[model samples]
Target: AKNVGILAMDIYFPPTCVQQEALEAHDGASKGKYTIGLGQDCLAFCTELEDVISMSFNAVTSLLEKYKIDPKQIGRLEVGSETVIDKSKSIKTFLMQLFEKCGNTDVEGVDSTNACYGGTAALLNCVNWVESNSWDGRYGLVICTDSAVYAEGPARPTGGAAAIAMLIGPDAPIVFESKLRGSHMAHVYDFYKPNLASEYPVVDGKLSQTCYLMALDSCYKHLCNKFEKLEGKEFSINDADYFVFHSPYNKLVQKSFARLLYNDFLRNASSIDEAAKEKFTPYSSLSLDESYQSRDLEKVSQQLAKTYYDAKVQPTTLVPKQVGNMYTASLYAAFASLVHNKHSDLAGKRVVMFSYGAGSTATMFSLRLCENQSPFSLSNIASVMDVGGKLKARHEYAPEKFVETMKLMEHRYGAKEFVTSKEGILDLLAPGTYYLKEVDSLYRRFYGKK
Candidate 1:
């Protein structure tokens, strides 16, 4: 198969959300701390009824139904998540319930785990499977699901819950530029979950921020080198029409794009005009380590890159800003936002994607977009996703209620033998959505359809 990539896609985020501005006030934060500082709007979170499993189930079912795909058509199923529902059993096993009905137990693949980069790993694996000599002509399905919940602290606002399903096969509208890939993997303590009993991560906020930018720099440079080797020319920011990122928060995305611009300046890319070059000249002499710490350089690059950021990066920020960080689903959510906003204009364009997961692994890759047939086209994917409609239909909870729900979830985190209260939650979920029903003493989880 040629042009092996995503053919159809669908996304599902919880309807329950808390407005950032409201949350700021409730948390006793100064005005605009989360709203402007983090550059986030609203945050979608799972209620007691919803989780990674249910969200992924809803997303997969929706994708298959919307695209008229049969369960038996999927030859490989890959799941990506950092949310640990079980220590040994894979989330892939939970998803098998869907395929079992069709007696399609021949699917291959399990789960990939890191931080937020698991989705990219799953996606690349599926793409490689189709491109390899495995000779199976069936489709590959990738599911990225996560419920990013943080303890009640500075990181709480970054929490988000979502699942995104992408069908992989040949002749895809979204084709991978498989050769133009670069990866950066290293050992770091930026963000990690140590206690198996808790759902939260131990985050060194400053260290994580630096680690992300550093990884971005390494990945971008490697990608540029690969592009140069293949195309016999240096690649610049202008070469790609859009740049999508694994957004932990909107502010980090803003900083990341600016960092790319700074990279262009350093590499003497033609995209960095004389004026911008002059503005960045002062910081050019700083060592790479010093550059990472320079506040002045960060501000200057962001200021200089604003116009380009609006043109190339702004469209991708919609979902991330609204939904907050979805861990493995974050990068794909940003790509979905691009499809939602610019599906019509995306034909023949190139999109650069950066995936990062703190602990920390990162990759910079490219995709070539074209207009394909119905159901597999970017337009069809966007319509089926209904990102705008979904955003509008969400129900916002008061900060107090959100906090209360969090407390309940904290208590329920690895515990068993309890049934969830379904009085109002089931009604909040849309039809065809999945919800957690109960957890038995043996740690068996039961789910129900709404």
Candidate 2:
């Protein structure tokens, strides 16, 4: 199979959200702290009526319906999520309900869990399956679903909920540059979920930031080597038309693009101008560890790379900034924004993607894009996703109400045998959206569609 990449895609995020500005004020944070400091506009979150399973259900069902794909066409279904509703039961099994209804229970994948990187793992597995000799000629489906909720503190504004579904097959518009991939994996305690009783992660904020940058540096270097070896030339920021990242928050993305530019400068790539070289020369002597910690270098590179960042990376920031962090879905949501904004002009473009999940694993990969026919076309994907319409339709809750919801969720996290109240949230959900109905005494979950 050739061009075995995403043929069609769809996304679903909860309609319930809290504006970052409002949240900052409610939390007694200084003005512009969250809005400017975190570089986030708003955050989408699930109420008690929704969870990762429901979000995944809504996204997969919507994608199938929108693309007119029959459930039986799916030969493999892969799920990626870090949200653990059950330790033993896979989220993939929960999603099987959708296919079982059509008597097509032959899907061949389970869940991939390792923080946010699970999505990329699932995507790569599906792509590999299609490319392998063992492949059956049916479609592969990848689902990235997550509900990121931090304990009440500075990280609270970063919490977000979203699910993204991608249909994969041969001759896709978004074709993978399979050989040009680089991955970095290491053991670190930057962020982890140790307590099974709570859904929140224990985060070492400063350490995680450093770990992310270090992993990025290593991945980019490896990818550059691979590209150079294959293309017989140096690889730089100018090589790819756009760069999409796993955005924990928008500020990190800003810093990430700047870091890439710094890499280009270090390699003395043609893309870096003389002025940038001169500016970066002083910091060229700094060790990798020192470079990661230097405030001056960060400021200089970000300032110099501002223009390039706006042109190559800004278009991908809309969804991540508006929706906050979706964990496993974060990187793809950013990619979806690119398609939504540039679908018409995306033919023959190359896009670079970076995926990172704390504990920590990362990968840098590239995709070649071109126009295709009807339902699999980039334009059709943009129309089907309706990013603008979804963002505009959201109902913003007051900080107090948002806090109340969070408090209620804390109590309801691991409890069972209780029915969720459908009073306010159910009425606000869009048509065809899935919501949590109840969890039985035996821990079986039931869902309802609106």
Candidate 3:
């Protein structure tokens, strides 16, 4: 009988990044390839001192402190990640240190792993728990954390790192439209980490894109189906004020949203303008197979969606464009960006969210924003996040140093008993930030706040 959704949230990414333009030059790539071709501006990456666990600590602790929430109030905690620090231990256990001091050791849930979709799964678990009859009148915490990295290849530049923590409860501004949720799942090897010994994934770049767009189409169709069943009317892009996606890069986000418009054109929905109808008429008869491979459609969709994308999806892109993909954290960070940029105008608006994880599971869902409710309000979330300020304060890591750091991480991926290069090799992180202190013999890990 209680309202249930995200109450407050915070995000943390490494303070170091490399400009896409600079990386392009370093890789002997053509001018504007990573910047213009991929539609990304920068890529945030962790140094030797940070990892998924450390970033999770920083984000979760910051959110608790910023909101002044007592640790005792959290009845459940869930973490979603693909970065495996240990083969058996969950990230939620490491996070338990925060509540251990307060004797609130009854936290529930654990790591949910299925690539990027894990975050949404963990979040839904928390929301479900709060809505059930066993409700404890306490908060549920969901943390989406990952360090997305790749070997030396084209996919390497898409790597990024970050963690997001969300406080969940009832009567929140960002309330989930529970009846409108839809999902699609299929078995595919489009993207996966079969090599447990290494941090890199075996990627089928072309096949992955096909799978992603295919999943998007299926999920969007199912979402519309649900909306129509619930509202007794067909659904279109116009039904939601904003659309956010799981962004591996900005270009994919652009292409995905346009695919929705293309769907509308297929349905002959009123959301499509006459100009769009004229532009897409040539490809109306293309089969799914042909459509996925159609370069013409890809180009024209982007062209048609440019201005509309800037208006609706652009505000959600700030963090993803600068931070690259955070695996599970990617989609949420985009939503955070929207809340940060357009909070003032979001009251009573509906937001459509699409989450995808390779190997592969996806869901399309909706959220309705209400008026400001002080500490848990949209405007307060925007002000506290200060996403723009965080982006501006980043220190640029040179391509050479970045390469050296990667080389070190390559050797230290699953090894133990080594100290990080934080003493004098690199400048210190800001105060109150967590960093890897050491991994002792027997592979025991330890951390410390800077």
Q: How many residue pairs clash per model?
A: 0, 0, 0
Runs with alpha carbons beyond 4 Å of true place in candidate 3: 424-428
Clash pairs of candidate 2? none
TM per candidate: 0.99, 0.99, 0.98
Cα deviation at 130, candidate 2, in Å, is: 0.6
Off by over 4 Å in 2: none
Return the top candidate by lDDT.
Answer: 1
Winner of 2 and 3 under lDDT: 2
Error of 2 at 109 (Å): 0.3
Deviation from native of the Cα of residue 444 in model 3, angstroms = 0.8
Candidate 1 residue lDDT tens string, 294-384: 9899999999999999999899999999999999999999999999999999999999999999999999999999899998999999999
Instruction: State each model's CA lDDT, in order.
Output: 0.94, 0.93, 0.89
- Spell out the clash pairs found in candidate 3: none
The stretch of ten residues in a row with the least summed lDDT in candidate 1 is 424-433
lDDT tens per residue, model 2, 33-147: 9998999999999999999999999999999998999999999999999999999899999999898779998789999989999999999999998998978899999999999
